[PDB]
Amino acid sequence: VSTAPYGAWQSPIDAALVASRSGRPACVGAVGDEVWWVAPRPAEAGRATLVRRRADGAEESALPAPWNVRNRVFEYSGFPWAGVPRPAGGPLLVFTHFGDQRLYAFEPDAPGGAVPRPLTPVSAVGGGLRWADPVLLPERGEVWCMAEEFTGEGPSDVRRFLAAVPLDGSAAADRSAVRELSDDAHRFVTGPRLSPDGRQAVWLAWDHPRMPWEGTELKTARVTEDGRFADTRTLLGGPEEAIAQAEWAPDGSLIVATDRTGWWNLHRVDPATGAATQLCRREEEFAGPLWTPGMRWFAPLANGLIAVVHGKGAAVLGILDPESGELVDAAGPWTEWAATLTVSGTRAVGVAASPRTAYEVVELDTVTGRARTIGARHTDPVDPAYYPEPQIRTFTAPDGREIHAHIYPPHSPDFTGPADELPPYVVMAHGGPTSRVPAVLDLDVAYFTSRGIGVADVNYGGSTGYGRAYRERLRGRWGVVDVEDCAAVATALAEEGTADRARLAVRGGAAGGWTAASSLVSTDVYACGTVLYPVLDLLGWADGGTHDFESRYLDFLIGSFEEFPERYRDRAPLTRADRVRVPFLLLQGLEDPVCPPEQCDRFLEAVAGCGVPHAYLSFEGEGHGFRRKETMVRALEAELSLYAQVFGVEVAGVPLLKLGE
Numbered sequence: 001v002s003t004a005p006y007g008a009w010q011s012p013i014d015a016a017l018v019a020s021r022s023g024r025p026a027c028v029g030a031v032g033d034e035v036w037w038v039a040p041r042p043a044e045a046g047r048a049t050l051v052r053r054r055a056d057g058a059e060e061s062a063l064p065a066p067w068n069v070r071n072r073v074f075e076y077s078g079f080p081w082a083g084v085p086r087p088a089g090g091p092l093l094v095f096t097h098f099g100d101q102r103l104y105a106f107e108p109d110a111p112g113g114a115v116p117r118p119l120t121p122v123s124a125v126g127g128g129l130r131w132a133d134p135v136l137l138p139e140r141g142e143v144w145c146m147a148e149e150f151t152g153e154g155p156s157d158v159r160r161f162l163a164a165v166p167l168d169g170s171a172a173a174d175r176s177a178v179r180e181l182s183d184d185a186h187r188f189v190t191g192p193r194l195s196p197d198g199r200q201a202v203w204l205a206w207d208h209p210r211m212p213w214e215g216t217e218l219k220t221a222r223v224t225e226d227g228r229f230a231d232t233r234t235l236l237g238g239p240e241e242a243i244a245q246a247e248w249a250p251d252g253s254l255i256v257a258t259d260r261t262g263w264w265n266l267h268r269v270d271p272a273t274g275a276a277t278q279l280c281r282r283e284e285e286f287a288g289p290l291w292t293p294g295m296r297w298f299a300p301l302a303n304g305l306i307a308v309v310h311g312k313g314a315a316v317l318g319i320l321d322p323e324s325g326e327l328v329d330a331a332g333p334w335t336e337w338a339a340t341l342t343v344s345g346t347r348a349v350g351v352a353a354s355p356r357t358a359y360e361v362v363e364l365d366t367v368t369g370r371a372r373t374i375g376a377r378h379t380d381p382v383d384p385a386y387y388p389e390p391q392i393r394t395f396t397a398p399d400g401r402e403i404h405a406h407i408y409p410p411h412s413p414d415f416t417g418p419a420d421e422l423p424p425y426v427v428m429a430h431g432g433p434t435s436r437v438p439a440v441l442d443l444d445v446a447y448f449t450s451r452g453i454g455v456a457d458v459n460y461g462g463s464t465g466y467g468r469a470y471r472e473r474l475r476g477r478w479g480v481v482d483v484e485d486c487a488a489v490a491t492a493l494a495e496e497g498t499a500d501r502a503r504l505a506v507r508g509g510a511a512g513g514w515t516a517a518s519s520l521v522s523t524d525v526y527a528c529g530t531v532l533y534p535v536l537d538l539l540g541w542a543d544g545g546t547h548d549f550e551s552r553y554l555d556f557l558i559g560s561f562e563e564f565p566e567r568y569r570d571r572a573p574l575t576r577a578d579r580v581r582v583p584f585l586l587l588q589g590l591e592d593p594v595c596p597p598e599q600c601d602r603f604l605e606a607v608a609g610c611g612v613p614h615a616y617l618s619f620e621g622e623g624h625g626f627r628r629k630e631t632m633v634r635a636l637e638a639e640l641s642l643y644a645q646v647f648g649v650e651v652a653g654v655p656l657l658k659l660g661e
Contacts, residue, residue: 007649032085046627078132079294126150133191307348424503589622
């Protein structure tokens with residue numbers, strides 16, 4: 001061990017390794033005795049593939065490039081696949097290919113191998129046709145899902161409804177062959193969930209200007225014999241009751257996760273009256289913000305037990321006995337479980353990680369209570385001694401309010417900083433903003449901490465996982481609460497003498513980019529900042545400047561335009577772009593439909609000539625969020641260079657970012 005300036009420590013973690021290991025298993029699901037999930041392939045044009053895990057442990061990608069398992073529903077991608085086991089011929093699977101947004105069917109065990117065949121027609125009108133959250137029904141020879149069909153060229157010129165697509169491929173070039181199960185009365189809907197007897201269907205629905213976490217309605221209908229929906233009606237829910245998920249238990253009962261008590265809790269629901277009964281009252285979240293159709297937090301098991309990812313703050317998979325109210329969590333090293341879940345037999349399978357291990361596919365068996373890794377087993381790319389040791393802390397702001405944050409101090413088995421120096425710190429603001437960041441191994445974080453630069457990940461007011469009230473703290477306060485909370489943690493760290501007050505950076509992407517930009521504009525706490533595909537122009541954004549799903553999200557964030565039109569200009573970073581007095585880095589994807597690159601251009605034009613050192617790197621072929629390995633490498637090394645230059649530290653492992661005024 002030797003002494004070296006903070007930020008200049010030699011680290012075995014390069015941006016290429018970081019990119020290579022980015023992402024996590026997602027959308028897990030059981031198919032007979034098999035377990036499938038979506039996995040990222042950053043080095044394969046940033047595509048996502050399907051992974052098939054056989055009972056005997058065999059684990060391999062089921063689709064080769066260029067197949068890309070992802071869709072553009074809500075622009076964030078709804079559950080992209082489905083699969084059913086069959087008596088002969090192997091399982092039948094369907095998935096949405098990102099390239100043409102079509103739903104495809106394929107049989108992995110067919111002689112010759114997987115040969116995807118299209119099931120849906122395309123459209124040149126606006127955003128065309130999109131599909132997601134499917135359920136295979138081979139008895140009816142169809143796959144049921146929710147669909148998006150653009151009717152105009154505007155981002156909101158679209159209708160959504162539940163649909164039935166023929167598995168025989170007769171609708172591949174015939175839109176009339178697609179059956180509309182529900183009508184298009186509701187702008188936003190999720191895929192259908194069929195009762196075990198196949199006579200009743202449910203689905204979530206909502207409209208502008210509400211976000212699903214504000215409120216949703218659980219719709220229901222009788223499924224006729226010929227496969228149509230009848231007597232559609234609202235079973236429960238409303239503009240202020242957030243129903244995040246609904247599932248049929250194998251015994252025919254209905255279970256939903258609602259926040260009517262102030263926290264998302266599981267409730268049994270009378271399929272006829274809609275009356276709900278508490279199954280486990282707790283000041284813990286048993287669900288989360290429904291950003292895409294198909295998210296699952298709980299899963300009913302055939303034996304009557306219920307698997308549930310729950311917790312206040314950190315979420316962990318546990319097993320609930322709705323009869324005794326008893327809840328037993330998984331053990332093992334995993335401290336955070338993602339919002340994806342499936343069951344098979346007495347087993348519940350989810351995706352979880354720890355501060356020392358990347359997300360793995362983990363199985364919890366109800367008979368033994370044993371939890372074990374069954375997929376994507378984590379191997380250390382470098383000695384785990386290079387990973388930071390997270391400190392889950394709650395800071396107390398001026399008015400006594402609690403601010404939840406994850407502190408990652410510089411950490412390295414080979415270096416220590418100068419006695420008379422304190423380490424610079426990078427303060428991060430997650431996206432959303434209605435979501436939360438878990439405290440697990442993240443090479444993007446270790447990339448900095450292993451070099452001598454601390455990191456502080458703040459779950460500012462408005463973050464999820466701490467009840468409706470905490471999520472509501474941000475209503476009408478975007479640009480103030482997120483900014484102040486992040487700054488509170490920063491300055492508190494400096495005052496405590498654990499961070500260099502003069503070397504604090506702020507960074508974030510999407511909503512987090514807005515927070516970072518806003519911080520550089522409305523405060524002088526930071527020495528520099530990194531902004532990724534942010535929202536900087538509110539007026540532009542509100543004026544048909546973003547996808548349909550978030551086209552009215554500002555009503556929640558800053559207030560309606562009808563009531564607070566003045567905020568749309570005052571809160572906008574673009575309006576005060578001239579107030580940025582420190583160097584910054586802007587990163588953007590050129591195919592971004594959520595935060596169009598125009599946002600950046602306008603900002604850059606507003607700061608030109610102000611003599612503020614800065615840089616802007618846009619990437620062709622990248623949408624909202626970077627998926628290609630080469631893109632991530634360049635984005636991360638650029639951010640590090642910015643910090644090296646501003647913090648007066650040397651880093652030769654990355655190219656020197658060219659900053660200009």
